[PDB]
From Swiss-Prot:
This is WD repeat-containing protein 41. One of its GO terms (biological process) is negative regulation of exocytosis. It is found in: Cytoplasm. Pfam families: Beta-prop_WDR41 (PF25178). Component of the C9orf72-SMCR8 complex, at least composed of C9orf72, SMCR8 and WDR41. The complex is formed of two protomers, each individually consisting of one molecule each of C9orf72, SMCR8 and WDR41. The protomers homodimerize via an interaction between C9orf72 (via C-terminus) and SMCR8 (via N-terminus). Within each protomer SMCR8 (via DENN domain) acts as a bridging protein between WDR41 (via C-terminus and N-terminus) and C9orf72 (via C-terminus). The C9orf72-SMCR8 complex associates with the ULK1/ATG1 kinase complex. It comes from the Eukaryota. One of its GO terms (cellular component) is guanyl-nucleotide exchange factor complex. Non-catalytic component of the C9orf72-SMCR8 complex, a complex that has guanine nucleotide exchange factor (GEF) activity and regulates autophagy. The C9orf72-SMCR8 complex promotes the exchange of GDP to GTP, converting inactive GDP-bound RAB8A and RAB39B into their active GTP-bound form, thereby promoting autophagosome maturation. As part of the C9orf72-SMCR8 complex, stimulates RAB8A and RAB11A GTPase activity in vitro, however WDR42 is shown not be an essential complex component for this function. InterPro entries: G-protein_beta_WD-40_rep, WD40/YVTN_repeat-like_dom_sf, WD40_repeat_CS, WD40_repeat_dom_sf, WD40_rpt, WDR41. The keyword Magnesium does not apply. WD repeats lie at residues 9-48, 51-89, 92-129, 181-219, 263-294, 303-333.
Length: 333
């Protein structure tokens, strides 16, 4: 259980994103276009970053550590963590940036909308696709050998990024493959352990891919048999929110191993495995449940009165949840 709880108040619209900054702080971001920095130990509100005029669509940290946010205002803003100063607003987009990702090795970060742009810390545009899609990149995930996988509707497009020769400043983006095996839009794209990545669609397709040669390994047209709303992964399992139920699929056995068909009174939104090996599920109605894997309901976390959009887990500071009810709740002990 988590007994004690703190209610952290600031947002005046749906809180969608939580992102850990360091060992004790995290940021939240909402449809109110506000970003807030919180102390996870004490629950103190540390900083507010105001500068977006519409909902935030993505937020990441760039390890001094920066915070980057994209918004339906068609900008990406880059924030200085310490001073809370706005380093730059980037507004050279004709469409909403939908995803942001860091390539650690190469020490760049990517924006994904109608096009893929490659950036460095100093905020130089190094390269960008032109007219990649009208659809928009819905997910970018790093895989080995400096490649990145982009979800574009039903398609996956794999790019390799090449740093310039010392002497030149010319980066290159090479398209290296397209995968066209989904009949439905790609909802989830996840790197499992740098050997596989997995994609899912809302209709219940699950595909496992080789992260090195980019070939199909396994395929399910409907891996659980109601739509799937979200997937996550550990080293060997996929945990899917499917209707009001949870399903656990083994990547090794290519089978559903565990199941709970009515885990909640409402659609399950998010389901994930914590480091400590417990499961957390989040629902439309506001309930959060903790499980141990048959699935045993350990904990019932009751407080939110509306969709729980995301959770964040600190080993030493407990559990954070955020909700369409404008609250963040920090659960402890």
């Amino acid at each position: 259980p988590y007994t004690e709880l703190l209610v952290l108040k600031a947002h005046h619209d749906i809180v969608r994103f939580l992102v850990q900054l360091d060992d004790y702080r995290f940021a939240s971001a909402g449809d109110d276009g506000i970003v807030v920095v919180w102390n996870a130990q004490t629950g103190e509100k540390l900083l507010e970053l105001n500068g977006h005029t519409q909902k935030i669509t993505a937020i990441i940290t760039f390890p001094n550590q920066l915070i980057l946010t994209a918004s339906a205002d068609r900008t990406v803003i880059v924030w200085d963590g310490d001073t809370t100063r706005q380093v730059q607003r980037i507004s050279c987009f004709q469409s909403t940036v939908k995803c942001l990702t860091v390539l650690q090795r190469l020490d760049v970060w990517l924006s994904g909308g109608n096009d893929l742009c490659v950036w460095n810390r100093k905020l130089d545009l190094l390269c960008k696709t032109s007219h990649l899609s009208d659809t928009g990149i819905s997910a970018l995930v790093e895989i080995p050998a400096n490649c990145v996988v982009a979800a574009v509707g039903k398609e996956l497009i794999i790019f390799r990024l090449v740093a310039p020769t010392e002497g030149s400043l010319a980066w290159a983006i090479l398209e290296v493959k397209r995968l066209l095996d989904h009949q439905d839009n790609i909802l989830s794209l996840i790197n499992v352990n740098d050997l596989s990545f997995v994609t899912g669609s809302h209709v219940g397709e699950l595909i496992i891919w080789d992260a090195l040669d980019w070939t199909m390994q396994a395929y399910e047209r409907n891996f659980w048999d109601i739509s799937i709303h979200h997937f996550t992964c550990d080293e060997e399992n996929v945990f899917a929110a499917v209707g009001r139920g949870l399903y656990v699929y083994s990547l090794q056995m290519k089978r559903v191993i565990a199941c709970q068909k009515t885990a909640h009174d409402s659609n399950v939104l998010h389901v994930a495995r914590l480091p400590n090996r417990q499961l957390i599920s989040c629902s439309e109605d506001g309930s959060v449940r903790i499980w141990e894997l048959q699935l045993e309901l350990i904990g019932d976390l009751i407080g939110h009165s509306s969709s729980v959009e995301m959770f964040l887990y600190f080993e030493d500071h407990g559990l954070v949840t955020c909700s369409a009810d404008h609250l963040i709740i920090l659960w402890k002990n």
